[PDB]
Write a protein that binds this ligand. Structure first.
Ligand code: NA
Length: 330
């Protein structure tokens, strides 16, 4: 089997992407944030504290003839941005882009933190990291990918995120029309439960490539590119008037600037992030200070190749016995 679903930016900045997901019988379609940095499929629901729901579409298990309580199971998660959610668990039928899994753990939120409530466009998360990070207790549950894997034509999914445009998540096949040149594959460590890999270096604009190992994660659920402070300083030093602002919480730059590109290495191959992808717009409405899309990972404890990086590539998440990542230009 295969599946193919369109993923759509939630706003004009590409802060996140939503993908429609069918849950239950008859189908309830929710727009979920596919997150290769976490491993829980959780939804706003009929159980969610009423004051914490503001515009989201909810899953109502009592209206699904295939829903079953997973008795005694609870979940609770905290993300890198300080957000959180928790609740209880149902199993139900879940379909993405025509690919169906029966018996998927659907984590029903009883509580969500303020950033989830405040984002009316995201109805929940669909985790695509390794199932070892799933938070369900006392019986850990599998991701949608892990439950689909054995049925897929190939044990893979691909992320093809758009810049200010829709893109695609595919399950079970490589669309050889969706990228240019060849795909470069690179090793993955699963030891922290992430799609963790080592970039071979970077360049800023038309500058020379610096060969250096940068360990980090491929994380569709993180907006920005978080890299070591040395690398980030070298990038923003090429932008007149850019500076790190402790008050704003990262590097800012004049909205009048034209940003240089940023290149990262994948083995001997190179992915170029256009300068425009690094502009996250005014820090507050009408400001002439703009927020940068490359930020320091110092204090986060890991480098994160988030959407800024991933949307410059066609990315293969290879879930074969020995996982690997692949990157192609597009
Ligand atoms: Na922000």
């Amino acid at each position: 089997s295969t599946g193919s679903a369109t993923t759509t930016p939630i706003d004009s900045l590409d802060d996140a992407y939503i993908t429609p997901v069918q849950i239950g019988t008859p189908a309830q379609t929710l727009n979920l944030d596919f997150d290769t940095g976490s491993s829980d499929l959780w939804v706003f629901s009929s159980e969610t504290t009423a004051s914490e729901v503001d515009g989201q579409t909810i899953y109502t298990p009592s209206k699904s003839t295939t829903a079953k309580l997973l008795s005694g199971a609870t979940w609770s998660i905290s993300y890198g941005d300080g957000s959180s959610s928790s609740g209880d668990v149902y199993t139900d039928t879940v379909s993405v882009g025509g690919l169906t899994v029966t018996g998927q753990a659907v984590e029903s939120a009883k509580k969500v933190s303020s950033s989830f409530t405040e984002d009316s466009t995201i109805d929940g998360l669909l985790g695509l990291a390794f199932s070892t990070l799933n938070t369900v207790s006392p019986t850990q549950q599998k991701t949608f990918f892990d439950n689909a894997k054995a049925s897929l034509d190939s044990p893979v999914f691909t992320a093809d995120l758009g810049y200010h445009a829709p893109g695609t998540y595919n399950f079970g096949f490589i669309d050889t029309t969706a990228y240019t040149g060849s795909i470069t594959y690179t090793a993955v460590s699963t030891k922290q439960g992430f799609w963790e890999w080592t970039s071979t270096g970077y360049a800023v604009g038309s500058g020379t490539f610096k060969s250096t190992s940068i360990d980090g994660i491929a994380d569709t659920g993180t907006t920005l590119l978080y890299l070591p402070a040395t690398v980030v300083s070298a990038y923003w030093a090429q932008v007149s008037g850019a500076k790190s602002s402790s008050s704003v919480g990262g590097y800012v730059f004049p909205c009048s600037a034209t940003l240089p590109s940023f290149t990262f290495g994948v083995g001997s191959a190179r992915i170029v992030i256009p300068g425009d992808y690094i502009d996250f717009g005014p820090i507050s409405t009408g400001s002439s200070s703009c927020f940068g899309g490359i930020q320091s990972s110092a204090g986060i404890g890991i480098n994160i190749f988030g959407d800024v990086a991933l949307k410059a590539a066609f990315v293969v998440f290879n879930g074969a016995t020995t996982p690997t990542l692949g990157f192609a230009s597009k």
